[PDB]
Design a protein around this nucleic acid. Structure first.
Ligand SMILES: [Mg+2]
Ligand SMILES: [Mg+2]
Ligand SMILES: [Mg+2]
Ligand SMILES: [Mg+2]
Ligand SMILES: [Mg+2]
Ligand SMILES: [Mg+2]
Ligand SMILES: [Mg+2]
Ligand SMILES: [Mg+2]
Ligand SMILES: [Mg+2]
Ligand SMILES: [Mg+2]
Ligand SMILES: [Mg+2]
Ligand SMILES: [Mg+2]
Ligand SMILES: [Mg+2]
Ligand SMILES: [Mg+2]
Ligand SMILES: [Mg+2]
Ligand SMILES: [Mg+2]
Ligand SMILES: [Mg+2]
Ligand SMILES: [Mg+2]
Ligand SMILES: [Mg+2]
Ligand SMILES: [Mg+2]
Ligand SMILES: [Mg+2]
Ligand SMILES: [Mg+2]
Ligand SMILES: [Mg+2]
Ligand SMILES: [Mg+2]
Ligand SMILES: [Mg+2]
Ligand SMILES: [Mg+2]
Ligand SMILES: [Mg+2]
Ligand SMILES: [Mg+2]
Ligand SMILES: [Mg+2]
Ligand SMILES: [Mg+2]
Ligand SMILES: [Mg+2]
Ligand SMILES: [Mg+2]
Ligand SMILES: [Mg+2]
Ligand SMILES: [Mg+2]
Ligand SMILES: [Mg+2]
Ligand SMILES: [Mg+2]
Ligand SMILES: [Mg+2]
Ligand SMILES: [Mg+2]
Ligand SMILES: [Mg+2]
Ligand SMILES: [Mg+2]
Ligand SMILES: [Mg+2]
Ligand SMILES: [Mg+2]
Ligand SMILES: [Mg+2]
Ligand SMILES: [Mg+2]
Ligand SMILES: [Mg+2]
Ligand SMILES: [Mg+2]
Ligand SMILES: [Mg+2]
Ligand SMILES: [Mg+2]
Ligand SMILES: [Mg+2]
Ligand SMILES: [Mg+2]
Ligand SMILES: [Zn+2]
Lengths: 211, 49, 157, 102
RNA sequence: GACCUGGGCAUAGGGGCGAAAGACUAAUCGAACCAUCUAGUAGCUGGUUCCCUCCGAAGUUUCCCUCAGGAUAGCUGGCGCUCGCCGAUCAAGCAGUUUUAUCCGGUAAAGCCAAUGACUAGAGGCACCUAUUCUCAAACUUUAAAUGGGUAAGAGGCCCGGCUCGCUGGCGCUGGAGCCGGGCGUGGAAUGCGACGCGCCUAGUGGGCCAUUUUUGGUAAGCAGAACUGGUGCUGCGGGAUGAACCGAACGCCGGGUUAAGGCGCCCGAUGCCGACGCUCAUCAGACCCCAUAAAAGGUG
RNA sequence: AACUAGCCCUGAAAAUGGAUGGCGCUGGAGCGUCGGGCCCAUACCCGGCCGUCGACGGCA
RNA sequence: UAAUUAAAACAAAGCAUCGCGAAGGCCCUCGGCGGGUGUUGACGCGAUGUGAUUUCUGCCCAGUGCUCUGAAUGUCAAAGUGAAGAAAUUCAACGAAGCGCGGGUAAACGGCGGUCUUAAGGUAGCCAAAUGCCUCGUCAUCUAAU
RNA sequence: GGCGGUACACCUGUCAAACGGUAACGCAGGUGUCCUAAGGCGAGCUCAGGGGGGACAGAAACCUCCCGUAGAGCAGAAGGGCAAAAGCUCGCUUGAUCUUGAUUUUCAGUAUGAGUACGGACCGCGAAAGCGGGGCCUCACGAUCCUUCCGGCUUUUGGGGUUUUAAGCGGGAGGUGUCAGAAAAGUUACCACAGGGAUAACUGGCUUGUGGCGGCCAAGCGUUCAUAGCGACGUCGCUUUUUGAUCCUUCGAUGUCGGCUCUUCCUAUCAUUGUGAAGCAGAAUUCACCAAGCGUUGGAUUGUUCACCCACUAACAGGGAA
RNA sequence: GCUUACGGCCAUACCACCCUGGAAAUGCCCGAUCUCAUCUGAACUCGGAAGUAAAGCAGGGUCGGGCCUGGUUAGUACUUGGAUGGGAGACCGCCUGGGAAUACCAGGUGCUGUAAGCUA
């Protein structure tokens, strides 16, 4: 296909696959969660992200290639059930390609820029400065392997990425310094891979079900 | 031989050259378009005072 | 190019507010619009009769003609570089009384209320409005309000 | 499109709503002694060829139907031309619709 | 030999003649030459003749068998005229500007645990169902700016009385409107300005181009197409070596002074300061808007 | 020991001989942060003159 | 093809078709029933195609065109005819050639297919040709190599 | 340019940057219709969907209950709007009628088209208030001339009268889709003219998709062993020896393919000089570095650049210089 | 305070469930002769007064859902204007002004006009 230098900058408005943009090929990446995705919150406390530093658009092929690069390194260093990689960028922006412009012809309705609006070529994920690309939650002693697994996957992406070990507990939105205190007060309950926030502002029957 | 289709580039500078004058609301504005039944009685109230 | 349709681009301006659909509240129907009063123009998609054009939505004019269900308004419309006085017929569901001159009429009655006091007291209290004057000289006490030292916080990624 | 053969519309000569007989209007025979026909033959006579334009590129598929409304009043049988919108199929007798049927 | 050739003859222009090439028909042939109609027409090239003074554009709107042109509006000029200052910022009136008040909007952002649509993951309950979760919209949106659009900031006002009406109607005052008279300047935001007042006639132009920002198609383009404003065309001058457009600043002829942008080793006016602190060695160093390319990735320099 | 940030280096190949403008500059004439002084535009200020415009202008 | 093309182009004999018996065919003239063919008469004149000889010249008359009928039902001018009307006029019948309908005709223009199918479905021949894109086809031969 | 398409007259959403306006052969669509009701009015009714049930009867026939903000429907494209409506059903209807002007949109503020508010007639529906002069709104359409029809005690047919005829006045229709509206098939390689670098076919310039070339990461190959030599999935570049894209220069002309000839230049180095590396024992070969000093051939076929083959050779490297 | 008639704003008024209440009034309720009305006096229409709170209705309740208001988010996001600011670029910082939204948290949950009537 066309090199990623041509569809790197968010130059056009977001052009999603919808009722109007028909004929989009399937994105290269179809799986976004890997590892032991069916793990509890207290099993993978650590969390590290691949934060984007540039306002660009990553192709679905790069998201798929970096996912495989990060997945293979986590298996050989932490086991197939010692991590949970979550690609947090879904390719929704559809990039277009113009016709295979040739010398001339008595057909194709054009030869040059006449009717230049192109057909859907692929899908990219418009990422923002500070937006997480990939997230990996592992055990506390696997920090060196996650930083290296995400560092190798940066080479599959254009631009500049930063590997940041988050202060949040796992894939939740609560800090580690506040997580274990909220479990004791029954304010958070484990719901699958993460926790579900339970406020003190519902029916009291739901409060009795916790205690 | 293609050309430029539409432009409003120099128009604002041409509009304010002689100024964009607001319509002069003269005293005793005209009575065109008022209700014909209302005007009919109004012309009867003027020929009897 | 575009179409010259009478409602091209009116997808949101003629729509109704969220959770404000249904019948028009009847107080809007029982408002009296005399001749020469200032009214706003806000078209409604519910009443498809007597609608103003999209160029008058948000404009303000005075009433010159009153009918059974509608009112004649004299509105200013800039075409290219000239402003023209347009006489449009709009039903009362698309208009409302303009509170623009209400602040003026409130001040007129208040000016006449304060100057007749001068003829009965002998003062010259100024009636003109004045822009926000520079703040006068004041003392800022620190008795129970000590200046707190602020510092720029370190960076956190 | 079907319109009934009877219409109780306004009669301009009766100054009142009267029943009318609706009939589709037909153009009629062109007179050989109309002024435009007399000078068209004078212009087309002799040598010179076709002197007037002959319209070729027609685009309309149908035409506006005209209804000849004749008043049924015995003393006032006044006609009136009433045109309706363009329709490809126009019938005057017609059979009225029935909803709850097959 | 369907040979070559003289002279005399015949065929004349849309005609001749042609063993055919549109060949030949007096150096002229896909229609000879001469004269005339004729100074044929050309929305198309070219040129269009003295000086100074003042004002000064347009490449946009609509229509056109229009798109190399016109009509039309705009922009331009000229001619005035009505006044105001004179005769006291008298006050009005006006404004590509604020202020105050009042409306208008659905773009940025935000949101989808809110609807429409798209999409990831587990979990609970008896494939669904419930509570959560990842990620999105230009033709989605509860919400919602900045900038912006309209209007109102007085005597053409405010208040009061009487009168008229065929309209309106329980109620000549029930509305409403009109007419007439009277009362009240502390002209009741800021700033600026004589009214860019009222007309008439009117040339040129109707190929534009460029920059910041916004923005569409395109891999991109010194590409194509838009929006605001400026510039340019129409414009020289200081600076960017050079230059259409960048930066500064717009121009009668001069002297002095001082600056802008940019500079001050030498070319080359100006640091020929005993300038401050640090960084930096390059066997392709580096050297300033536009701008005359350089990246990912690396270095125990 | 990891990471990061400046300058420099590698990455870095085009055809006539050549371009921080040139010379050259390496306690600099380079880079970054700044100070003082200084240089001149048809810009600004003062004055002279020319013309135009305006004068709520002056004289029979 | 004078003055860029001498040729495979033109002509050619041969072959074949077409028209015409003279009040004719073909053609000329503004015109004369004037003129050419024609001082001619079908072994002739005029109009085309093919192109010596040899060998053959298939199939298609649907389309187009030409031509032949008129037990020719239509379409159908001027004039003439009938009727109505003060008349202008209107209406009606009649109604040539030609068209339509029918037949013939391809050495007339032309055409000559993937159980489907049309009008006939490329026959005898010939060929990667002066005609084959794919293509510098495949094989053989010709050369160290084409 | 032609072919295609219609961006030629219109409509919706978006583009459009929160008034309005705003372009491209921008995007997603629609239109030349349809409807005597699918118009008007009144009354009653509530839809889509889901659930519980109930002979035949089932995942879908019909009855019934509950929930149901409309998630249905409203002729059509889309947007908007709509719940005792604008939807459904029913029974009464012809406001889809006759007229004058004002007015909105497109706009020059012209016409036409499409709308709005009135006034004056005559009516429909409803007990009534009221509602309606077509379609819930935004689209569904046409000048002059001519023809045709309707309308008028009202004109002219002129030296008068009567009667035909004709003309005229007022209003419809017959149509111009290139939709502000000519009546209109090609070809020219025999060509001509006025022009155009407003506009193609060269070079050059910008761009580099494509072509060519070089990197980064390291899954994997290499018996084992990522990195001797290679490099999947990705990704960053360079080059202007490919082709395009563009139309800036040139149409009062820059001679147009290839070869021959001849000079110089570039290195992205085939050979040769000096080296490093190996999955380097030798020989041969491969990778890489300094490096363009020097060399890079003779032929068959084709007009060929490009190919292919024959031999020779240290090697028979690739290019630029309009 | 409450019950009705007509309303205004149109959820602070809605929705679910629970509890309480009949003084007047309201509602249910009792009937189909008449008017009227349907497959069916259920509805609609009409006639009535045996019962009185089951429902409607009203008033409470719920760490209720929704809605409303405010805080937080946040001077964050975005944005007017400026630079010969940075960076290869993508973009970012600053200057000058304007200034959001969700999550989250807290409070609240109909107000009121005209007319008539009644003090459980
Ligand atoms: Mg154009
Ligand atoms: Mg133009
Ligand atoms: Mg559109
Ligand atoms: Mg329209
Ligand atoms: Mg309507
Ligand atoms: Mg004749
Ligand atoms: Mg001779
Ligand atoms: Mg001639
Ligand atoms: Mg020829
Ligand atoms: Mg002349
Ligand atoms: Mg053109
Ligand atoms: Mg020209
Ligand atoms: Mg002009
Ligand atoms: Mg003009
Ligand atoms: Mg352009
Ligand atoms: Mg100028
Ligand atoms: Mg200048
Ligand atoms: Mg320079
Ligand atoms: Mg000086
Ligand atoms: Mg210098
Ligand atoms: Mg780097
Ligand atoms: Mg390396
Ligand atoms: Mg370097
Ligand atoms: Mg001076
Ligand atoms: Mg010759
Ligand atoms: Mg010869
Ligand atoms: Mg031959
Ligand atoms: Mg023969
Ligand atoms: Mg033949
Ligand atoms: Mg035949
Ligand atoms: Mg042929
Ligand atoms: Mg055969
Ligand atoms: Mg138009
Ligand atoms: Mg705007
Ligand atoms: Mg319509
Ligand atoms: Mg009426
Ligand atoms: Mg006659
Ligand atoms: Mg046209
Ligand atoms: Mg050009
Ligand atoms: Mg490439
Ligand atoms: Mg291996
Ligand atoms: Mg690769
Ligand atoms: Mg251009
Ligand atoms: Mg020359
Ligand atoms: Mg030249
Ligand atoms: Mg030359
Ligand atoms: Mg080298
Ligand atoms: Mg190697
Ligand atoms: Mg109870
Ligand atoms: Mg709550
Ligand atoms: Zn009648």
């Amino acid at each position: 296909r066309r090199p990623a230098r041509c569809y790197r900058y968010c130059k056009n408005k977001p052009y999603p696959k919808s009722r109007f943009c028909r004929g989009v090929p399937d994105p290269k990446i179809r799986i976004f969660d890997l590892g032991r995705k069916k793990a509890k919150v207290d099993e993978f406390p650590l969390c590290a992200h691949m934060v984007s530093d540039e306002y660009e658009q990553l192709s679905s092929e790069a998201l798929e290639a970096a996912r495989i690069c990060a997945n293979k390194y986590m298996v050989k260093t932490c086991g197939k059930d010692g991590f949970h990689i979550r690609v947090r960028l879904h390719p929704f922006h559809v990039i277009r390609i113009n016709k295979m412009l040739s010398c001339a012809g008595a057909d194709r309705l054009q030869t040059g820029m006449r009717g230049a609006f192109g057909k859907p070529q692929g899908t990219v994920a418009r990422v923002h400065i500070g937006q997480v690309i990939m997230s990996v939650r592992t055990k506390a002693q696997n920090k060196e392997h996650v930083i290296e697994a995400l560092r190798r996957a940066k080479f599959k992406f254009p631009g500049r990425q930063k590997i940041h070990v988050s202060k949040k507990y796992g894939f939740t939105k609560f800090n580690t310094c506040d997580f274990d205190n909220m479990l004791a007060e029954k304010r958070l309950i484990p719901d699958g891979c993460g926790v579900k926030y339970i406020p003190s502002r519902g029916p009291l029957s739901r409060w009795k079900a916790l205690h | 031989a293609k050309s430029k289709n539409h432009t409003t580039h120099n128009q604002s500078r041409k509009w304010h050259r002689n100024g964009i004058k607001k319509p002069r609301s003269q005293r005793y504005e005209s009575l065109k378009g008022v209700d014909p039944k209302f005007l009919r009685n109004m012309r009867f109230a003027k020929k009897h005072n | 190019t575009n179409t010259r349709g009478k409602r091209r681009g009116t997808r949101y301006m003629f729509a109704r507010p969220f959770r404000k659909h249904g019948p028009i509240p009847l107080s809007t129907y029982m408002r009296i619009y005399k001749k020469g009063d200032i009214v706003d123009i806000k078209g409604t998609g519910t009443i498809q009769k007597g609608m103003p054009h999209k160029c008058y939505h948000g404009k303000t004019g005075r009433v010159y003609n009153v009918t059974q269900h509608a009112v004649g308004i004299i509105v200013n419309k800039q075409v290219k570089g000239k402003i023209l006085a347009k006489r449009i017929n709009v039903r009362i569901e698309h208009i409302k009384h303009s509170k623009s001159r209400d602040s003026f009429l409130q001040r007129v009655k208040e000016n006449e209320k304060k100057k007749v006091e001068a003829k009965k007291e002998g003062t010259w209290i100024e009636l003109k409005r004045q822009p926000a004057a520079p703040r006068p000289a004041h003392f800022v006490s620190t008795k129970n309000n000590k200046p707190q030292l602020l510092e720029p916080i370190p960076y956190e990624f | 499109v079907n319109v009934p053969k009877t219409r109780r519309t306004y009669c301009k000569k009766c100054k009142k709503h009267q029943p009318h007989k609706v009939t589709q209007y037909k153009k009629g025979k062109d007179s050989l002694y109309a002024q435009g026909k007399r000078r068209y033959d004078r212009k087309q006579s002799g040598y010179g060829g076709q002197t007037k334009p002959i319209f070729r590129k027609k685009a309309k598929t149908t035409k506006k139907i005209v209804l000849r409304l004749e008043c049924v009043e015995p003393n006032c049988r006044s006609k009136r031309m009433l045109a309706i919108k363009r329709c490809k199929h126009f019938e005057l007798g017609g059979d009225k619709k029935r909803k709850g049927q097959v």
